[PDB]
Paper text:
Microbial epoxide hydrolases, cis-epoxysuccinate hydrolases (CESHs), have been utilized for commercial production of enantiomerically pure L(+)- and D(−)-tartaric acids for decades. Studies have shown that both RhCESH[L] and KlCESH[L] adopt a two-step catalytic reaction mechanism by 18O-labeling studies.
In light of this hypothesis, we constructed another inactive mutant, RhCESH[L]-E212Q, which was expected to halt the catalytic reaction at the second step and create an enzyme-substrate ester intermediate. RhCESH[L]-E212Q was cocrystallized with CES and the structure was solved at 2.20 Å. The D18/L-TA, E212Q, H190, and the active water were all with unambiguous electron densities. The carboxyl substituent on C2 of the substrate is bound by residue T133 and N134 via hydrogen bonds, as well as a water-mediated hydrogen bond networks; while the cap domain’s Y58 and R59, along with N134 and Y192 from the core domain, bound the carboxyl group on C3 via polar interactions. Interestingly, residue R55 forms a hydrogen bond with the C3 hydroxyl group, and the substitution of R55 with Lys leads to a loss of enzyme activity, along with a significant increase in the Km value. This suggests that R55 should play a critical role in positioning the oxygen of the epoxide, as well as provide a proton to the oxirane oxygen atom to form a hydroxyl that facilitates the epoxide ring-opening reaction.
Residue numbers in the entry:
A (entry chain B): 3 to 246
B (entry chain A): 11 to 246
Write the structure that this text describes.
Amino acid sequence: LVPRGSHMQFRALLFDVQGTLTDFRSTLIEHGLSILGDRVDRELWEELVDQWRGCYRDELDSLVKQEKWRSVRAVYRDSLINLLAKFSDSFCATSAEVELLTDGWERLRSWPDVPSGLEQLRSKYLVAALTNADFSAIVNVGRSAKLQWDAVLSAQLFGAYKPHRSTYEGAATLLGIAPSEILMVASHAYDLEAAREVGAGTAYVRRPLQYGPTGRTEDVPDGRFDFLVDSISELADQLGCPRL
Amino acid sequence: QFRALLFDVQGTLTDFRSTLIEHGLSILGDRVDRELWEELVDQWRGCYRDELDSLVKQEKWRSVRAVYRDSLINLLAKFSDSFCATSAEVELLTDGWERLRSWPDVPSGLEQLRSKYLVAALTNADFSAIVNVGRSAKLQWDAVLSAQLFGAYKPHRSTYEGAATLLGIAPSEILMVASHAYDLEAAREVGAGTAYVRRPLQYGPTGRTEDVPDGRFDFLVDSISELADQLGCPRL
């Protein structure tokens, strides 16, 4: 008789990237402060950056509602333009600086666990980014965040953002494997819940610093998702991927 | 100057023939002699090549795995007097196109290019095939692009244009890298730079070498590392 074993029958790990793998907030804060210099203080810039992702999320929630896709870089830029208008009394940015500020969403550094965790996961699973960011943006953050993918997948490829099912199912179709063999890895519950809806596995990566050192992150209960980890290496360990 | 290097993969980066030959023989063992299987593999690529040539002409897209499977199924019937294959082995034999081994230069050459360029696969192989070929050929990509992404094979313009749009890089800033002149000529026609990688063994010894003189394309190289060298990428 063959013992049941402990292997998990996932073929691909689909990764949300922003926040889940990348310290976007620290990048955007540092990027903006570097670009804007003495025109913005950290707290004022931090509040804009926090409002920036909220505007991006609000706009992406709105676009998902109407089944619309647009360039997420344009989403980041348009939301920044709106926020610069509300903070216009405090500081200003040129178009060139707005372009440079938007680029920060494409210069995200990864959390220290991610590059080794992604490589550690390679030994058993395909790792593919499934990001709402434009395909170029994720290709770009892959350089700044040292993300080595088997596949870069974007909402752009599917003409639809996560949580829309076509993103996960399309990613499954592209990867040539059933969604039930996809482990979705996100730091955001919406992403995993939708991936669970299409049958994919759910791995929540706790990112306590995602929204800052004092930022508020959802304390996902144990058992909500198939995996609850604070490190991609930790997820890799729980997936039978030995550390190298 | 280029911002991304767009690579054709089958042949250009991968010794698909030796891959498919050894892969088939590993599956079929002594049912089929090496020479007979080698003939099947050569006709197999031919069926794929001819099918894609036609589908390109008709602006039609099909799963390239289906193209490999269907052509293999027809080839298995044609060769069914010499050997047979179960339905499972047809799948396993067709899997060999997703197990392509790279040429010895490609892993180091791709990595050396990474330091100064985005490197992205643009293959006619289905997205799953190139992703799996990345594992077998040890191809680390910034981006994997399949004809499946665009519903159109190379050399169709929307593949290079689609790759440009996806990479966020103007075609003039994309160096197309291919072992086939058709790929680069069309990429040249979208404004992309052209690097021809000579792969004299890609069709085997009997394979005809499509002659490419110096000056036909921007780069004429015998390896990816040589292309990286000609592109200013420091060695490793």
